[PDB]
Design a protein around this ligand. Sequence first.
Ligand SMILES: *[C@@H]1O[C@H](CO)[C@@H](O)[C@H](O)[C@H]1NC(C)=O
Ligand SMILES: *[C@@H]1O[C@H](CO)[C@@H](O)[C@H](O)[C@H]1NC(C)=O
Ligand SMILES: *[C@@H]1O[C@H](CO)[C@@H](O)[C@H](O)[C@H]1NC(C)=O
Lengths: 96, 48
Amino acid sequence: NSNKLDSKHSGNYDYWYRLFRKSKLKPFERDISTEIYQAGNKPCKGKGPNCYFPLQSYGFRPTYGVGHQPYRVVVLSFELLHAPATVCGPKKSTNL
Amino acid sequence: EVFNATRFASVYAWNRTRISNCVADYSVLYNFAPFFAFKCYGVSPTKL
Ligand SMILES: *[C@@H]1O[C@H](CO)[C@@H](O)[C@H](O)[C@H]1NC(C)=O
Ligand SMILES: *[C@@H]1O[C@H](CO)[C@@H](O)[C@H](O)[C@H]1NC(C)=O
Ligand SMILES: *[C@@H]1O[C@H](CO)[C@@H](O)[C@H](O)[C@H]1NC(C)=O
């Protein structure tokens, strides 16, 4: 939980998140784009009715509920397959 | 019938209409009037 860096008085609307995408997101793929979601059959490009921005604000304030707090989430991905490695932990070097 | 009334009650006594046993046509929510505010909060206005 990080309510001290993603919160300040008078609010903070810096962060973003997407709800309108043409299809699903493939694993580990980034779809950074500003394309207005099509609704109905209009080629409309902009904000307003039936023309919505794909990404909405993730606005954060110091006074929310627990489920609405600015949780800081870092995911770690590991690749343990038959290949030369790079990262380890404690290591002893007894001779062969 | 709920969107074409003539005696919309005052705010101090807001008339309540119960909606059930239907299929929810939503093109009427779009074509009716040029509109002035369409702020949706919990449900996506197109994924409804
Ligand atoms: C990569 O580009 C293709 C073709 O435009 C697109 O279908 C796909 O979703 C893109 N992938 C990412 C990483 O967004
Ligand atoms: C309301 O109903 C009358 C007839 O019942 C109709 O003529 C009128 O067009 C309706 N109002 C709107 C805004 O369509
Ligand atoms: C709305 O107004 C109609 C007509 O006056 C009335 O019959 C109905 O009971 C009202 N609905 C309320 C008060 O919830």
